[PDB]
Structure 1
């Protein structure tokens, strides 16, 4: 302008460093910042001041994976002990982002639910048929092959164990416990009287008590 007022508005791709918390992934909220300042000058030569309290999101393209909850900018003054009256200035904009948890519910969670229900089904299958181990171990194989999708999709960071990973590991130990207990049931079924005599506690608890207690049965 003819008064010397200058307005410059250049574009930029900002790649910022951000502490990412994955404790609640895929239902996690992130607070991400952009710290700006003058590099070679101090607050006595070049002063900066924010134009508004909140960033400008009037032309913001909706994301598809994230929802903007709040955003605000703050200006800071920093003094050092070596220089009593020299301030160092910086404006810090922050953005609070909530994740849309659908891609990760349909691609990682529903299969785990399915596998857990199947892990429970094995106990209604009679040992006379020779397929209890087939069923159990095939459920385990499917879960191990799904691990390939989990490793392809989930973030491989070691800051903490995510919630989705706690669930994957609960399912794993659930399946493995089912398999162990299935092997103990099969062993108890093919038990030869020639070598093993039924003890009194087993004949009392599993023949004369629970059968009667069991209501939902035939």
Structure 2
């Protein structure tokens, strides 16, 4: 009735969607964008991939949508199908590893005035730095910039809207934890061209990682392997009679940790970390080797411990006396004294380089913990 056909028909004829509501030679199209992140289903620290969801809160205006008693009058705020809208090719600058999903075919907010918004529950795969410095105790801030794709400032402009945390809806099931999340705006003009280029929203995710699983198993075999090394040292005192035995456990030990480092490379390259870390294990453990090097080398360090009838009685006890001073010789080498210095020499030195391992390890977390 109320100009029924005359009102919707006229609207379709002199209305265009390819076009953008450009208003004179000025501020561009006033684009209002923001992140409304409520779920992070999957991400990989190793490949620095993030498939999350953020409703793309857009907000801008088009006067052409203003109306009178025949559209506003009908029902104040009316929601129009998005099609009529010029949709920006937004995209994650150093990210964007995936299409935004669920934005197409959606609803658009129109007002009596013209105000309009459309928050799409967009889910997509991203790509931002985490590098080997992603999961430390001291974190890294993933730089995530977002802004118009193929359109320059001379035609469209976006700007932040509000600060909101990253932990506002951060994953409690994450193998990480957040500290802070900031987002400020800017416009990037480049020395290349004298022109005024695109605008963008730069997010920075500051959060420390690393569950403690890998941690528990790195140190258990270490203390346990330090038990066998400790045995390594104590045995020659309490059972040097098993120095070879010691040898067996070094083939044991060695293969075990040489195999421990196998795990590392798989896990490490399977889950990212700053190399500076493995350096700890490196020398500390090459230390058990450097030390078993010297210690068992030293352990094996020693030459071989690693009438006339009255006459033969004398040729005989002679036979015995010769050998007796001789057996004294092999014991002359296994003095059972330096064995105690070697375990204590190294017990302290491992208690110290262990305490050294313990040192930067805890110093670094007296830095992280912060």
Does the 8 Å CA contact 1:24/1:162 hold for their aligned counterparts? yes
Does the 8 Å CA contact 2:152/2:197 hold for their aligned counterparts? yes
Does the 8 Å CA contact 2:136/2:209 hold for their aligned counterparts? yes
Distance 1:205 1:21, change over 3 A: closer
Does the 8 Å CA contact 1:137/1:179 hold for their aligned counterparts? no
Does the 8 Å CA contact 1:122/1:132 hold for their aligned counterparts? no
Partner of 1:205: 358
Cα deviation per residue 1:136-160 (whole Å; 9 max; x = unaligned)? 4555455556558756764669999
Does the 8 Å CA contact 1:115/1:143 hold for their aligned counterparts? yes
Deviation at 1:21, TM superposition (A): 4.4
Structure 1: where are the runs of 5+ without partners? none
Q: Distance in 1 between matches of 2:305 and 2:185?
A: 83
Cα deviation per residue 1:143-189 (whole Å; 9 max; x = unaligned)? 55655875676466999999997776766766676677768777888
Question: Under a length normalisation based on structure 1, what TM-score does the superposition of the two structures give?
Answer: 0.62
Higher strand share: 2
Does the 8 Å CA contact 2:134/2:208 hold for their aligned counterparts? no
Corresponding position: 1:121 with 2:274: no
Q: Distance in 2 between matches of 1:62 and 1:142?
A: 41
Distance 1:157 1:189, change over 3 A: closer
Deviation at 1:50, TM superposition (A): 0.8
Does the 8 Å CA contact 1:71/1:94 hold for their aligned counterparts? yes
- Segment drifting more, 92-101 vs 14-23: 14-23
- Segment drifting more, 73-82 vs 186-195: 186-195
Distance 1:216 1:76, change over 3 A: closer
Higher helix share: 2
Q: How does 1:1-218 map to 2 (within 5 A)?
A: 1-22=111-132, 27-55=137-165, 57-81=167-191, 83-126=193-236, 129=239, 132-133=242-243, 136-137=246-247, 139-141=249-251, 143=253, 146-147=256-257, 154=264
Deviation at 1:63, TM superposition (A): 3.0
- SS of corresponding position for 2:142: strand
Distance 1:27 1:209, change over 3 A: closer
Deviation at 1:87, TM superposition (A): 3.0
Cα deviation per residue 1:7-27 (whole Å; 9 max; x = unaligned)? 222233443333334369653
Distance 1:7 1:129, change over 3 A: same
Distance 1:173 1:45, change over 3 A: closer
Q: Distance in 2 between matches of 1:90 and 1:207?
A: 40
Deviation at 1:37, TM superposition (A): 1.1
Cα deviation per residue 1:42-69 (whole Å; 9 max; x = unaligned)? 1221110111133465444413411110
- Segment drifting more, 6-15 vs 179-188: 179-188
Does the 8 Å CA contact 2:135/2:208 hold for their aligned counterparts? no
Q: Distance in 1 between matches of 2:125 and 2:283?
A: 40
- Segment drifting more, 187-196 vs 67-76: 187-196
Deviation at 1:88, TM superposition (A): 2.2
Does the 8 Å CA contact 1:78/1:89 hold for their aligned counterparts? yes
**Bigger CA radius of gyration:** 2
Q: Distance in 1 between matches of 2:226 and 2:189?
A: 58
- Segment drifting more, 12-21 vs 151-160: 151-160
Does the 8 Å CA contact 2:176/2:207 hold for their aligned counterparts? yes
- SS of corresponding position for 2:171: coil
Q: Distance in 2 between matches of 1:140 and 1:27?
A: 34
Aligned-residue RMSD, C-alpha:
11.0
Cα deviation per residue 1:105-164 (whole Å; 9 max; x = unaligned)? 212222223212431331221379576455545554555565587567646699999999
Cα deviation per residue 1:78-107 (whole Å; 9 max; x = unaligned)? 223454342321111111011254212212
Give the length in aligned residue pairs.
Answer: 212
- SS of corresponding position for 1:157: helix
- Segment drifting more, 178-187 vs 105-114: 178-187
Structure 2: where are the runs of 5+ without partners? 1-110, 308-354
